[PDB]
Amino acid sequence: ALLSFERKYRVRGGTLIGGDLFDFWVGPYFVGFFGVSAIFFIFLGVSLIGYAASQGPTWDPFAISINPPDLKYGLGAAPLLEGGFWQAITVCALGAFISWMLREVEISRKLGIGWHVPLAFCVPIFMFCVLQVFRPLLLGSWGHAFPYGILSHLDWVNNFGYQYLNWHYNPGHMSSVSFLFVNAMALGLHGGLILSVANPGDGDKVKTAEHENQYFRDVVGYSIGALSIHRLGLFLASNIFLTGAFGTIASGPFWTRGWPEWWGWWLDIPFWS
Amino acid sequence: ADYQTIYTQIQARGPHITVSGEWGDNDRVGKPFYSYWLGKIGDAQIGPIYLGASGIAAFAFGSTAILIILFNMAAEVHFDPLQFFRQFFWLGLYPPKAQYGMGIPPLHDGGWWLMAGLFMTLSLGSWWIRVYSRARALGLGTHIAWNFAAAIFFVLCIGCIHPTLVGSWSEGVPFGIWPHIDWLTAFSIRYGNFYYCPWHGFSIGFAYGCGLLFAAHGATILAVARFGGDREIEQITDRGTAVERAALFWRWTIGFNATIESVHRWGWFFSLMVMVSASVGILLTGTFVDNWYLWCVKHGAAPDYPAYLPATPDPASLPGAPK
Amino acid sequence: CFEPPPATTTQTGFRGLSMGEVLHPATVKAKKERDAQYPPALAAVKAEGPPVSQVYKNVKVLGNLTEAEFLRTMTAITEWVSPQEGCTYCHDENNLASEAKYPYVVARRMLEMTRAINTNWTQHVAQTGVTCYTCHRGTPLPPYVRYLEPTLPLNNRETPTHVERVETRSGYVVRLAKYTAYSALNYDPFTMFLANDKRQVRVVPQTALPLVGVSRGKERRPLSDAYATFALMMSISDSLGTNCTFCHNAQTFESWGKKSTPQRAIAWWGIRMVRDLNMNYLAPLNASLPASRLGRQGEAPQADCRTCHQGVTKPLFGASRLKDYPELGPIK
Amino acid sequence: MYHGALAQHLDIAQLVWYAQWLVIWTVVLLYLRREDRREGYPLVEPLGLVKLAPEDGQVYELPYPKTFVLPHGGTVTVPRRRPETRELKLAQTDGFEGAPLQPTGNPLVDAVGPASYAERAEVVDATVDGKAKIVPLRVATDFSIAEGDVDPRGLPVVAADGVEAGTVTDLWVDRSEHYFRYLELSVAGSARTALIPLGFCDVKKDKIVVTSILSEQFANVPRLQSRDQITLREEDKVSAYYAGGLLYATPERAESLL
């Protein structure tokens, strides 16, 4: 039930709210107040999903879609089957995510370690808000949000993109993609390197911190360091959405033309026109 | 608050370190030098750097490729300098616009592109050799060279192998900033929408996942930096409270947990798989699947919706419709 | 380089597909005001007596009009095409039957073309119809036209920079980009698609799997076609001042039925209509134009979607004079 | 006829979808999920009064052991059975295994909850060339503080309770990574030094502020056995001590944050 080393850590305390009342574990899972709210919402959200999805035609998982209302309902409450479900499921989603997040804080507190993971987790929640709440508010209808369906949310991404002719030239998107791609490369680099040191092959000795530094000084002329490559990755990953959020938000509220034309600001400097 | 996880409150200077490799220690060129500001959020020493043969090779092929592209790009603005600097993004070196099948294109219609293609390829190879050798020289495993190979192979897929498989060079990736981006849409449109390609989905899944994983891993390490969690090598060989606390964070949150070595495996694998899934997705495209939406439709996958504006018949199919 | 909210948005698709228009009010309103300059219809005259076929000497097209109507038409024409220049832009000051000046005979062809559009391209122009004003906008040379190579500025009422001038080779990539909504697509949709009916717009295949025998080597259309078709569609978009979801559900560009809007069938007709006008009316006019008029390959200026639409999904926001001047068709 | 078409409604890309899934669950469940179990397995539990089997699934979920050959000698094999022998000053607050434990003494010195350390080697972490790795600058003489930063030697250390608790005497540096990791201070009113990991230090120009523990609680900061040397397991004891300050420095700290 308990890892070899677990018991010495399972002490009361660290709660954000509730104190002793829910301060306990079920199996491996810590519960705590937010574990309890988390579950409440998950159960709600998932229930609406099933009740809504039953009203629809399909039960094929790829095809099921719970979508938002028509643009006409604006920012108001929409009939259940015509966006009502979607508005409710969205509220359960936020409840779930934020509970998940606050719950991580209580676990962090209890182990006397920094709260960096719940913080890092704020970014994805943020970007979910930019897509489903902030941008719909700025544009004035919940209808602009994305549908809850494995495939359908892609058809939304697809159209949203082509509304602006070529979404690729969106300077926010460009920056966003660039972090997605480095982050991925660096996770490969950082994992490969740690394994390369601890797993030299045949029967050779596990190597050293000094090696790590040498390999990257040799290969690319700079090694960032053990502590720092974790501070970089948290940064690279986080800026996928933190910069992306700008390209998403600008689209409609601040720019209504194709994105290629935005580059007019450069191409059209009269000096070289 | 742990300010060390943000930046280095007091920086240490001390004599430059060298770890000797099974060879080439004489090829480390340059004098180490030290940046204070860099020191704030990283190691302060920049350089030295191994030269080496496969390195010099890679630099030389890489540069050849760059000159072929840049010359062809300069031809486009008719060697006008300012218009060059102005239009640079839009400038490109394209594959054959015409269908030569697999026939070597004329220089003016893709000949030059295949040239640069070949040289960049050699550049990539000589670099793989360097990435692989330095590990072996320093007595390390080659996990990095193996993650890299997957990335090179992806490129070989989109630049060569898929063109070869369907039998046309016109399908390759042009060199240029906007031009390589334009290709993405062209390739998706010809193939019936890459959203409906199951491997584009796996790829993205892992790409997002790397974001998920590097943010959770990075932060987890900063969050136990207090207990020296960053000395990951010795936390492997001799588990300490850094990674016992790291593990219980994750066990208590999601119910299962990695070890401080295994997590890097999960990462390596996730990073690898972005490039592996992408390649399979390309190897199947054009060869065996022509319209990914219809393939999906053929198999029951695709969503479908009520009309909102009236369903619009193909005019072209109409009784008496022109051509 | 940004545009302050609110944005005007519409829905062209089932809810949750993010399909529809996205308009910045100030621009729409600036276009409204420009298109507002459409002179009103001249007052209706009573048809008295003799078809000008009897009355006048050299009347070929509008011959069944009684005089009063005929001179109403001539005034309207003057008001649309050559307001600054007045009747003598086309007529001999002292002989109105004279074909001495080319605008006369070009105008004659343009009465036929105009009546063709209204009579025969109903599936595009419907009951709105075009008049000369639709293209000419009060000048003899219409503001947006296309030569057999991209030119700049798109509005030919503006003065070219050196680079913009067709002669300046360095300016090519820009002349081309600016025609394809700033993309770097290295193709000209106009001469590929609109100048004639040589090329096929559809590139996407209509079976899940590659049909054996059109799917390898020189059997295949080259990827460059897909670029071109993207190039053309970027151009149409910019021409109508709208985006792909005006016509397509991007889920499947290639599918019709529920996957396309009404406007895509209308668009499909418009491409065909434009080819007719280019092949059969406009391109031949190089026979009759001053060299001052012609492109570097001796081509007459011709038409695209911009020539009528000028940035609006319906030209002049759907303003019509079809019922006011039926000389121009639909001709029974 | 179609490229890819295998049979009735069967085609290449579709079989490859099934292979791709398989390859993923194989690697994930049968490899990665077992690499994760090199540490901490098998799970510990209460004891059964009568039990006799090498419980089947405890075998199946483990990888085969791997051995690391260490750079300055010896080896380490994982997984391996690594039970916590040390006695724990914690008391069950309720019955069920869900229930949290409570310290029965001073958990800071007891070393429980946030104050726990791992049973690391009692060995001095070494550089690549054999030397002691984390050593005071008194010893690490070719090292220095970068011009521009605070030299804390001389500065007062001020504890959670605002009370000056000692005086920074030295910094210890990581010679492998050229990176400071603890400060040494002369504890006030005691004849002892304490190290404090640089993460528990807010480093001002004129004082070093430490918020994990009250000035009182430095007295019992873990002691080293050498003065210019520190073991992997000592590092853990030192580090855990202040870390446990955070939940335990005062009675209100463990209670509901708001």
Ligand code: BCB
């Ligand atoms: C034709 C349209 C296109 C398009 C349209 C598009 C749009 C419309 C947007 C992007 C955006 C983005 N795109 Mg683009 N895109 C991208 C890459 C990217 C991303 C980096 C970026 C942000 C993604 C995001 O919002 O995640 C969202 C992730 C979320 C919301 C995570 C939520 C997680 C939540 C916190 C927790 C969820 C918990 C689960 C419910 C739990 C399940 C329980 C189980 C697991 C137990 C690439 C690499 C490419 C390439 C190579 O072609 C590309 C092409 C294109 N994009 C097309 C051109 N793209 C976004 C952007 O940032 O650009 C500015 C954006 O808005």
Ligand code: BCB
């Ligand atoms: C702006 C752009 C968007 C975008 C663009 C995007 C693209 C373009 C693609 C996906 C893909 C996927 N997306 Mg989408 N996405 C998803 C979830 C998903 C999965 C169905 C799939 C793989 C995700 C993954 O592996 O990531 C990494 C996460 C990992 C490894 C941990 C496991 C998480 C788990 C796989 C998620 C499964 C959750 C359930 C499907 C959702 C229901 C849960 C509830 C009901 C119990 C969620 C839950 C959200 C939310 C909460 O915001 C989201 C937002 C968005 N997606 C944005 C709207 N996403 C890919 C796909 O194949 O879709 C068909 C793909 O092609």
Ligand code: BCB
């Ligand atoms: C409208 C067009 C679409 C499109 C078209 C598209 C295509 C055509 C392809 C992808 C592919 C991929 N897309 Mg998709 N896409 C993606 C994300 C992704 C990636 C996961 C993956 C590309 C893999 C990669 O890392 O390349 C970046 C990594 C690279 C290029 C590796 C570089 C390796 C190399 C060794 C480094 C070079 C070294 C040197 C610097 C070279 C310099 C030397 C000099 C001499 C030249 C997202 C997240 C979204 C969203 C959010 O909507 C999206 C939408 C869409 N995609 C649209 C539907 N997508 C690929 C794929 O996975 O399909 C199966 C693919 O082929």
Ligand SMILES: C/C=C1/c2cc3[nH]c4c(c3C)C(=O)[C@H](C(=O)OC)c4c3nc(cc4[nH]c(cc(n2)[C@@H]1C)c(C(C)=O)c4C)[C@@H](C)[C@@H]3CCC(=O)OC/C=C(\C)CCC[C@H](C)CCC[C@@H](C)CCCC(C)C
């Ligand atoms: C830039 C940084 C990033 C980042 C970072 C981090 N990410 C984290 C952490 C960090 C640091 C954690 O600490 C936390 C975690 O614990 O890790 C294990 C977490 C997690 N990241 C998950 C998914 C994930 N991260 C994505 C992206 C990024 N992550 C980006 C890349 C994506 C993408 C890209 O698609 C996905 C889908 C979950 C597994 C997990 C939340 C579990 C949850 O919340 O449980 C509580 C909620 C549930 C179990 C279900 C609730 C169901 C609702 C009510 C009903 C469904 C709602 C509906 C909206 C769904 C529509 C589906 C439709 C579109 C098809």
Ligand SMILES: C/C=C1/c2cc3[nH]c4c(c3C)C(=O)[C@H](C(=O)OC)c4c3nc(cc4[nH]c(cc(n2)[C@@H]1C)c(C(C)=O)c4C)[C@@H](C)[C@@H]3CCC(=O)OC/C=C(\C)CCC[C@H](C)CCC[C@H](C)CCCC(C)C
């Ligand atoms: C899922 C995993 C992924 C992943 C993985 C990995 N990625 C790796 C590795 C791994 C693991 C390596 O080990 C290897 C490396 O070593 O890293 C440290 C590498 C690399 N990934 C690079 C770029 C990158 N990765 C991308 C993507 C992904 N990566 C995906 C996501 C992308 C994307 C995002 O598009 C980009 C652009 C380079 C930095 C690097 C190769 C350089 C090269 O191959 O050299 C080729 C050689 C040259 C370019 C020489 C020419 C250069 C000069 C300066 C030009 C001078 C011109 C002048 C005229 C000359 C004058 C001369 C004078 C004397 C007169």
Ligand SMILES: CC(C)=CCC/C(C)=C/CC/C(C)=C/CC/C(C)=C/CC/C(C)=C/CC/C(C)=C/CC/C(C)=C/CC1=C(C)C(=O)c2ccccc2C1=O
């Ligand atoms: C049962 C019940 C009703 C309970 C009440 C209590 C309660 C609230 C229970 C929760 C119930 C629920 C809803 C559980 C589901 C939890 C979730 C959301 C699980 C998601 C699992 C996924 C998909 C993770 C994706 C990322 C991924 C592939 C991770 C695998 C690799 C791991 C384990 C990463 C975590 C990890 C990281 C990031 C480290 O860096 C690290 C460093 C050193 C040691 C260990 C680790 C480590 O474990």
Ligand code: HEM
């Ligand atoms: C401006 C108000 C104006 C006048 C006046 C005018 C008159 C006019 C007449 C009387 C005729 C008939 C002469 C005859 O017997 O042949 C006639 C015929 C045509 N016109 Fe005209 N016209 C005025 C202006 C213009 C303008 C501005 C143009 C050229 C753009 C133009 C052209 C023509 C043409 C062509 C004909 C032939 C009519 C036909 O049915 O063939 N006119 N005009």
Ligand code: HEM
């Ligand atoms: C409507 C009945 C109509 C008239 C009248 C008209 C006249 C006209 C003239 C006088 C010219 C020659 C101008 C010159 O100086 O060269 C001319 C040329 C073009 N037109 Fe026209 N035109 C009428 C109608 C239409 C319509 C509906 C359109 C657009 C679809 C159109 C377009 C053009 C174009 C293109 C040319 C050739 C380029 C040029 O000579 O400037 N016209 N028109």
Ligand code: HEM
């Ligand atoms: C917006 C930039 C946009 C894109 C992208 C786009 C693409 C596209 C493709 C790929 C085709 C090919 C279809 C096939 O291969 O079967 C295609 C065809 C047509 N389109 Fe389109 N399209 C975009 C925008 C627009 C707009 C704004 C409209 C409607 C005004 C439109 C219309 C059409 C029509 C009509 C066709 C068919 C051409 C023919 O049959 O000759 N598209 N589109």
Ligand code: HEM
């Ligand atoms: C060029 C190939 C081209 C395109 C593309 C195009 C599209 C288009 C659409 C989508 C509509 C209908 C919009 C709606 O119903 O909301 C439409 C309508 C009209 N067009 Fe057009 N059109 C193209 C070309 C041309 C040209 C060259 C002309 C003028 C000679 C022209 C004219 C019109 C007219 C008139 C209408 C309006 C119909 C109405 O209901 O008001 N178009 N076009």
Ligand SMILES: CC(C)=CCC/C(C)=C/C=C/C(C)=C/C=C/C(C)=C/C=C\C=C(C)\C=C\C=C(/C)CC/C=C(\C)CCCC(C)C
């Ligand atoms: C059968 C035969 C003969 C050969 C086999 C085929 C072969 C191996 C061919 C290979 C084809 C391949 C590898 C093609 C791949 C193409 C791809 C993937 C291209 C991808 C991206 C291209 C990009 C972004 C190009 C950008 C280029 C540049 C920006 C040029 C760089 C410019 C500078 C260094 C100077 C900047 C100048 C500025 C200051 C004005």
Ligand SMILES: CCNc1nc(Cl)nc(N[C@@](C)(C#N)CC)n1
């Ligand atoms: C101790 C590990 N050092 C280390 N690790 C990694 Cl993954 N990268 C680097 N350096 C760069 C330049 C590369 N490649 C990325 C910043 N140094």
Ligand SMILES: CCCCCCCCCCCC[N+](C)(C)[O-]
């Ligand atoms: C195909 C890529 C280019 C091949 C030529 C590159 C030069 C080879 C240098 C290898 C040097 C050998 N070493 C030390 C790495 O084993």
Ligand SMILES: CCCCCCCCCCCC[N+](C)(C)[O-]
């Ligand atoms: C989209 C790419 C596929 C993502 C792969 C996700 C792997 C998650 C592994 C969790 C399995 C956990 N457990 C306990 C069941 O083993």
Ligand SMILES: [Fe+2]
């Ligand atoms: Fe790590």
